[PDB]
Design a protein that fits this description.
5 helices; alpha/beta; 5-stranded mixed sheet; globular; Glutaredoxin; protein-disulfide reductase activity
């Protein structure tokens, strides 16, 4: 998962013809840390898609405008449009993330 470090970079990768998956997170967060222990196989299954991270405190403008309400959240984009949003309250286990991505990519 490559880190996005600016608003322009964010705009740029979300205007992809092929879908893009972005994890919003922060370094202090033990739920964000948890997710990293189990997310790598899901990333591999979903290899065909680009995965990125956004630090929630670093790009607030992005966070607020994409209606990111807690962390970790997983949002999916295609041609600039937000196509799915996994809110952090439901992002607690690999089962939950897998199910969200299956529902979004079906």
């Amino acid at each position: 998962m490559q880190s996005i470090k600016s608003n322009e970079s964010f705009k740029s990768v979300i205007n992809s013809d092929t879908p893009v998956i972005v994890k919003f997170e922060a370094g202090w967060c033990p739920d964000c840390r948890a997710m990293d222990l189990w997310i790598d196989p899901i990333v591999e299954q979903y290899n065909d898609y680009q995965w990125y991270t956004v630090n929630r405190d670093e790009l607030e403008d992005v966070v607020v405008e994409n209606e990111v309400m807690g962390i970790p959240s997983l949002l999916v984009f295609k041609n600039g449009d937000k196509i799915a949003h996994l809110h952090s309250a439901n992002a607690k286990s690999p089962e939950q993330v897998e199910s969200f991505l299956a529902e979004t990519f079906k």
